[PDB]
Nucleic acid binder design. Structure first.
Ligand SMILES: [Mg+2]
Ligand SMILES: [Mg+2]
Ligand SMILES: [Mg+2]
Ligand SMILES: [Mg+2]
Ligand SMILES: [Mg+2]
Ligand SMILES: [Mg+2]
Ligand SMILES: [Mg+2]
Ligand SMILES: [Mg+2]
Ligand SMILES: [Mg+2]
Ligand SMILES: [Mg+2]
Ligand SMILES: [Mg+2]
Ligand SMILES: [Mg+2]
Ligand SMILES: [Mg+2]
Ligand SMILES: [Mg+2]
Ligand SMILES: [Mg+2]
Ligand SMILES: [Mg+2]
Ligand SMILES: [Mg+2]
Ligand SMILES: [Mg+2]
Ligand SMILES: [Mg+2]
Ligand SMILES: [Mg+2]
Ligand SMILES: [Mg+2]
Ligand SMILES: [Mg+2]
Ligand SMILES: [Mg+2]
Ligand SMILES: [Mg+2]
Ligand SMILES: [Mg+2]
Ligand SMILES: [Mg+2]
Ligand SMILES: [Mg+2]
Ligand SMILES: [Mg+2]
Ligand SMILES: [Mg+2]
Ligand SMILES: [Mg+2]
Ligand SMILES: [Mg+2]
Lengths: 208, 328, 132, 177, 343
RNA sequence: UUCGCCAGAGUACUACUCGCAACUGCCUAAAACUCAAAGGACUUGGCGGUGCUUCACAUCCACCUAGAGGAGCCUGUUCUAUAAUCGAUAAACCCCGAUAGACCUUACCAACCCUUGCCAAUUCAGCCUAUAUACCGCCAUCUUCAGCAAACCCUAAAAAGGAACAAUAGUAAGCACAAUCAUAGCACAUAAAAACGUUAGGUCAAGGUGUAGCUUAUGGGUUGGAAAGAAAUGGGCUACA
């Protein structure tokens, strides 16, 4: 809030500035970006120019963080990635030659694919009409869909596990199940879709 | 109050002579930058408001512009627009309209004669000219002003400027123009320094969340950081803190081309990491061209972080958390 | 609503002084303190004694000069000698003013075991700052 | 207007026609009154609320040495003069209306304020004006540029002649003693 | 104990409770007696209980060319001085307890008809010393406000007149009664009517006017019928200069409407000279006690028409039934011929 | 020029008569009794589960995070119980007066003593006695809402209102708002400020107080006790991993 309305969000992509001469449309904007005396906010500590970080991973770590233990959240994320990598390597080495060309060991791509698989398509909005609340089906925004996809998995893995089982160990199994379209997160997404299909006849209640 | 200001002028002159005599400076060379300096010493009033401090200026600055007499001894008003309420603003509007009509008729005659000698003298972008503000116009015209009349005057001035400018019209329209200050936000680049037969030596300072960091960078050594006498790996066990160090160097691709020594105090781990990142970014400006320092400042490396913890308020918990408000 | 050291605004005819026209939150911003001493510093002591002496001086001078006092007194404490500056309406003759100042300069000195100076500035009337 | 019937010669296919005999009869008296007021050192204010000839009226008043009002007429100008103009101000001794109606097609404020303050008013009235409160009504046209210029020049020359004759009378008075 | 004392200003402000919260909305007015006494009125700063005479305060500094030492009065002298001081207290209380009776224009507890004094002079310096004014009506007007609620404002009708035929009326409304009086006085002089008075004692002709809802019937009277009119019309005519008149007000008796109608009727009079000018005939007065003597009051200046007016055998005059009853003696009311006080 | 009606309101499109294919019907149509009013129109606020536009930025929802209401403890209240204070006790009370209780604090009670009894004196001291519905001093709420308001002027009268920017009666000191100030550079943010009034809001117990009451006592001193929880509830800490 200390930054005034004139402050603009910084650009972290280095390739955006490394080759400004490859296109002319961006030139007209980046030449007047600084001419208008546009002040730029400080770069956040979470976001950097490293190539091994992803905004999706950062958002998931922030959502998993409890209170202010960002170090603990980062350690949990790293342990989950290590666990999924090792579990994929074990299956890669236990499988035959034909399955090795199909099984994937990269944790980032399987994490993104699992998140997309567990992303809902449409959601429900409670609308009050006639003194009663109806769950009207409604298209969801991209950010809302991604947040719901992350939140469902986080809530399931925080509560539906045994005390002896650790968070990275549970998350490693859940990510694989979601990637293979077998997890309770996928079941919850299907339940939401079925509820929306049941309440589709109430979609006329929406006014936007 | 015409005689009162005149008497105050003589009293101010006498007081200026006395102040110069008692301070010991030459009264002939005594000016306002000495008057205020001597006042601040003789009457050291410590107050937060500057206008509450003792001040001795010429009466024309202290007293506001007093309205001149409008009618003679016989009661006849001097100006012909006295009964219009605003005899200065309306006279100015009448003169502007008369000059606009003169310009229009002269341009019509010139077009009839088929002559074009005027040019476009309305584009003053390189000069940096602007129109007068309401307060500036109220300074020129002793009488009070409004918003609608000021807008009408500005819209008539732009109409006049949109026509082929004359010889005497440009000087009249220029007296309502004001120069703007430089809006350049380009920072000052420290020159490369050579101390104790050491080449490519620079220094930078950074502050973030009660953390002060001073970083010295040598452009001839290998890539390594020495913080508080220990290596950065030992001083920052957290990978995010080391990513803060990597953020400026990776943007300039100078990971293994500069050796940096930092001294940071105050704050926590993240505050120290931010302070050293800011100091390193500010120090690296000397070793890079002017094209990439602007890229760093647009990426957010050369700007401070004003996010400081707010003071706790009475009756609250954390300056935002209110107590449990019971409705009944 | 805040009411401390705040004179309520009338219909627009009451005379107020410069000190009265400023709210207490303007202290050290637009107006200064009526008394100056070293007791209210950080590493100093003996502040309660100075405060009680100051309030006794206020109450004593209010009765000593009844009806002719213009505004609050100024109590300067500077190296064991105490200066008291007052603004007084020129209602009493100078013959009585000198009698009163000579009485006070000795009474306060013998009561507080310290030298005192008393300075009076005569004014034709109370100075008006805001609307009168 | 209902009160313009005695001042109309007739109607020429919808458009009313103002008779010029009574126009000249009223104009002679109006010019004589204005010249006498100027001769007796009276303040004359040319009032007109019409956004076509405001500059012409201002220039005519400047040439005459009399005062003009062609802008937004303030509320308590003539009535609350001691608070609108100054502590002690001398009100105009004659008000000359060049346009009785304002931009809202309504009677002007000054045409009533002059009657309230006992200020004589000479006014040019069109077929849609109300001459009841005007001391010297002149039935004519106030919408044609030549019509406006004719009245402006007539008042200009009347003021100039009155002032010049006053100066000549004073010059003779100087030699009389 | 000394530090526990306060100042007299705060003591009186707390004792009187002038700014109390119960007297704002209107819960007060029960004990309407507010009096503040200054205790420093007659207290000499040198005098005291022990009776010391200080050379700088009580006694002169130099006497007989020498300096005076600290002296003390005797017990008898102190008793005399304190007796004089006590006597001053009751002397001031005597003045404080005395209240001069207020004016009774129409009744002992009304402001109708009371004198308010000459109006204030104008900005240019004109002074109205010959003008006398009277209050016709005082009414407490209330308005509903969002915050306070009822907003009491006094509205006063005030009529000015010089006795020479020039008079006017105005309405002043203000929060305070004195401010309303001042506003009405300063605004009445701006609206002055001139009343044509026949022989400066009566009106030229009888007038029957019908205002908004008030009917006023005024009849010309001789020198012996002095102001037998309503209690406010009598005051207005006394201010104007009319000494003889009979007026009856029927219908609504609203004060403002009555005043406006009376002024309109008096302003719309027709002078004898005006009638002579408009008829081109001589106006001849036939006095009853002067026999058949044809007294001429107005001369038709200009062209005197020689054509006599058409003599109507039966005049079609809009008569009034009350006047017909009065002429025929059918007015048997007991309130018509009552004996009343002089003007 | 005529005809039919109107004499406060309620009683009352009523009762009692006459007349009528009407028999719970229609027309005409009172009185006793009660009141000083009953009524029509209008102005300003307030309200509206009226409608139309613009809004909500921790605010209503669409939505995010952390908690209360479940357990123990601490603490404050409401209740029972004692000889054993008091006030607050809807938003604006409930770790509130109290940034603070073994004696003192403490104004409560029981036992005992003193009555010109703190001060130079006073047919005087002293009262935490009642009245916050008599106050000052200090605050709470609307409230980060902007309006309040002296002096004038105008209205075919005036309860009241006062505006059209290509301007149609509005000028307006001043208090508010704003700006400035402080968080040692700007900007932002925070802090501070927030008038006139509403809640007869809280405070005679910070202190003094107008009125009404005590004076061998409702005043002044010493000792000892001021529990306890059948129960309910507010706010916090600890956790339920
Ligand atoms: Mg917190
Ligand atoms: Mg016309
Ligand atoms: Mg009486
Ligand atoms: Mg009546
Ligand atoms: Mg009846
Ligand atoms: Mg019926
Ligand atoms: Mg019936
Ligand atoms: Mg909320
Ligand atoms: Mg918790
Ligand atoms: Mg709970
Ligand atoms: Mg609980
Ligand atoms: Mg209690
Ligand atoms: Mg209670
Ligand atoms: Mg409450
Ligand atoms: Mg005890
Ligand atoms: Mg105890
Ligand atoms: Mg007691
Ligand atoms: Mg109260
Ligand atoms: Mg405003
Ligand atoms: Mg009004
Ligand atoms: Mg103002
Ligand atoms: Mg600052
Ligand atoms: Mg700001
Ligand atoms: Mg605040
Ligand atoms: Mg402010
Ligand atoms: Mg109460
Ligand atoms: Mg209470
Ligand atoms: Mg008390
Ligand atoms: Mg009590
Ligand atoms: Mg409890
Ligand atoms: Mg609390």
């Amino acid at each position: 809030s200390r930054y005034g309305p004139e402050y603009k969000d910084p650009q972290i992509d280095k390739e955006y500035y490394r080759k400004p001469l490859a296109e002319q449309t961006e030139e007209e904007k980046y030449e007047r970006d600084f001419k208008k005396t546009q002040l730029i906010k400080a770069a956040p500590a979470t976001k950097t120019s490293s190539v091994f970080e992803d905004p999706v991973i950062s958002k998931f770590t922030n959502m998993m963080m409890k209170g202010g233990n960002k170090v603990l959240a980062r350690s949990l994320m790293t342990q989950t990635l290590e666990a999924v990598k090792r579990k994929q390597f074990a299956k890669y080495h236990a499988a035959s030659a034909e399955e090795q060309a199909t099984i994937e060991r990269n944790p980032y791509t399987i994490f993104h694919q699992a998140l997309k698989n567990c992303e809902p398509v449409i959601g429900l909005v409670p609308i009050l009409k006639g003194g009663h609340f109806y769950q009207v089906p409604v298209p969801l925004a991209d950010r809302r869909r991604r947040f719901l996809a992350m939140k469902w998995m986080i809530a399931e893995c925080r509560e539906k596990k045994h005390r002896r089982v650790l968070m990275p160990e549970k998350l490693s199994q859940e990510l694989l199940e979601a990637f293979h379209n077998q997890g309770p997160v996928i079941k919850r997404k299907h339940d939401m879709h079925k509820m929306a299909e049941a309440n589709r006849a109430l979609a006329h209640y929406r006014w936007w | 109050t015409v005689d009162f200001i005149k008497k105050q002028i003589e009293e101010f002159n006498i007081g200026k002579r006395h102040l110069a005599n008692m301070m010991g400076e030459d009264p002939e060379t005594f000016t306002q930058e000495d008057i205020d300096r001597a006042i601040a010493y003789l009457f050291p009033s410590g107050l937060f408001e500057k206008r509450a401090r003792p001040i001795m200026k010429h009466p024309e600055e202290i007293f506001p512009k007093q309205r001149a007499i409008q009618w003679g001894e016989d009661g006849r008003p001097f100006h012909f627009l006295f009964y219009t309420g605003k005899q200065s603003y309306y006279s100015l509007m009448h003169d502007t309209y008369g000059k606009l009509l003169d310009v229009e008729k002269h341009h019509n005659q010139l077009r009839a004669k088929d002559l074009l000698a005027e040019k476009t003298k309305i584009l003053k972008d390189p000069i940096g000219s602007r129109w007068l503000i309401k307060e500036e116009l109220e300074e020129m015209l002793v009488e009070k002003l409004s918003d609608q009349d000021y807008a009408q005057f500005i819209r008539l001035l732009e109409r006049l400027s949109a026509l082929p400018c004359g010889a005497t019209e440009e000087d009249f329209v220029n007296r309502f123009r004001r120069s703007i200050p430089i809006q350049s936000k380009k920072q000052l680049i420290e020159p490369l320094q050579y101390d104790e037969q050491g080449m490519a030596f620079s220094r930078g300072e950074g502050k973030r969340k009660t953390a002060k960091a001073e970083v010295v960078v040598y452009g001839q050594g290998s890539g390594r950081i020495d913080v508080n006498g220990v290596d950065y790996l030992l001083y920052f066990p957290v990978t995010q803190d080391r990513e803060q160090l990597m953020f400026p160097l990776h943007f300039l691709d100078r990971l293994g081309k500069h050796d940096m020594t930092c001294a940071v105090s105050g704050g926590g781990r993240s505050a120290q990491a931010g302070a050293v990142r800011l100091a390193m970014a500010r120090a690296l400006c000397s070793f890079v061209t002017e094209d990439e320092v602007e890229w760093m400042r647009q990426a957010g490396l050369l700007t401070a972080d004003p996010r400081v913890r707010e003071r706790k308020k009475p009756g609250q918990e954390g300056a935002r958390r209110k107590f449990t408000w019971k409705k009944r | 609503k805040n009411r401390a050291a705040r004179v309520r605004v009338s219909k627009g005819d009451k005379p107020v002084t410069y000190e009265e026209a400023h709210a207490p939150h303007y202290i050290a911003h637009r107006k200064g303190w009526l008394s100056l001493h070293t007791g209210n510093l950080d590493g100093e002591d003996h502040a309660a004694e100075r405060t009680v002496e100051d309030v006794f001086l206020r109450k004593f001078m209010l009765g000593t000069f009844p009806g002719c006092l213009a505004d609050q007194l100024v109590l300067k404490r500077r190296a064991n000698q105490l200066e008291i500056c007052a603004l007084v309406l020129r209602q009493l003759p100078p013959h009585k003013f000198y009698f009163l100042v000579g009485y006070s300069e000795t009474l306060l000195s013998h009561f507080y075991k310290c030298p005192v100076h008393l300075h009076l500035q005569t004014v034709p009337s109370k100075v008006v700052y805001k609307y009168i | 207007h209902r009160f313009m019937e005695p001042y109309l010669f007739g109607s020429r296919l919808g458009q009313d026609i103002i008779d010029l005999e009574q126009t000249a009869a009223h104009l002679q008296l109006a010019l004589n009154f204005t010249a006498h007021v100027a001769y007796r050192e009276g303040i004359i204010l040319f009032v007109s609320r019409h956004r076509q000839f405001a500059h012409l009226i201002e220039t005519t008043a400047r040439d005459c040495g009399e005062y003009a009002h062609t802008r937004y007429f303030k509320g308590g100008l003539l009535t609350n003069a001691p608070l609108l103009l100054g502590p002690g101000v001398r009100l105009p001794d004659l008000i000359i209306f060049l346009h009785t109606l304002n931009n809202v097609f309504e009677p002007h404020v000054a045409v009533r304020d002059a009657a309230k303050m006992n200020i004589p008013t000479v006014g040019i009235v069109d077929t849609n004006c109300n001459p009841a409160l005007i001391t010297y009504p002149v039935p004519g046209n106030d919408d044609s540029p030549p019509a406006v210029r004719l009245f402006c020049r007539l008042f200009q020359v009347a003021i100039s002649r009155a002032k010049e004759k006053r100066r000549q009378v004073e010059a003779l008075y100087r030699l009389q003693g | 104990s000394f530090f526990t004392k306060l100042t007299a200003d705060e003591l009186w402000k707390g004792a009187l409770a002038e700014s109390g919260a119960g007297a704002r909305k209107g819960r007060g007015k029960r004990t309407k007696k507010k009096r503040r006494k200054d205790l420093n009125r007659g207290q000499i700063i040198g005098e005291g209980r022990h009776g010391f005479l200080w050379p700088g305060l009580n006694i002169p500094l130099m006497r007989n060319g020498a300096v005076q030492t600290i002296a003390q009065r005797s017990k008898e002298d102190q008793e005399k001085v304190e007796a004089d001081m006590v006597q001053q207290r009751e002397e001031w209380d005597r003045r404080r307890k005395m209240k001069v009776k207020r004016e009774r224009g129409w009744s002992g507890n009304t402001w109708g008809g009371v004198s308010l004094g000459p109006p204030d002079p104008g900005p240019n310096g004109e002074t109205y010393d010959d003008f006398d004014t009277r209050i016709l009506e005082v009414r407490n007007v209330f308005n509903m406000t969002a915050k306070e609620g009822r907003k009491r404002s006094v509205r006063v009708l005030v009529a000015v007149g010089n006795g020479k035929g020039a008079a006017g009326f105005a309405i002043g409304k203000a929060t305070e009664r004195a401010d309303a009086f001042r506003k009405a006085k300063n605004r009445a002089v701006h609206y002055l009517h001139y009343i044509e008075r026949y022989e400066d004692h009566t009106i030229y002709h009888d007038i029957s006017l019908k205002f908004k809802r008030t009917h006023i019937k005024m009849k010309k009277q001789p020198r012996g019928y002095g102001l037998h009119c309503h209690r406010a019309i009598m005051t207005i005519c006394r201010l104007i200069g009319i000494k003889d008149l009979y007026a009856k007000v029927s219908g609504s008796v609203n004060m403002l409407n009555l005043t406006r109608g009376l002024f309109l009727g008096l302003s719309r009079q027709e002078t004898h000279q005006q009638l002579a000018d408009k008829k081109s005939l001589h106006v001849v007065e036939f006095r009853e006690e002067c026999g058949p003597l044809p007294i001429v009051v107005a001369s038709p200046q200009g062209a005197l028409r020689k054509d006599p007016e058409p003599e109507d055998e039966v005049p079609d005059i809009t008569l009034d039934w009350e006047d017909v009853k009065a002429a025929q003696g059918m007015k048997r009311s007991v309130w018509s011929g009552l004996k009343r006080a002089a003007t």
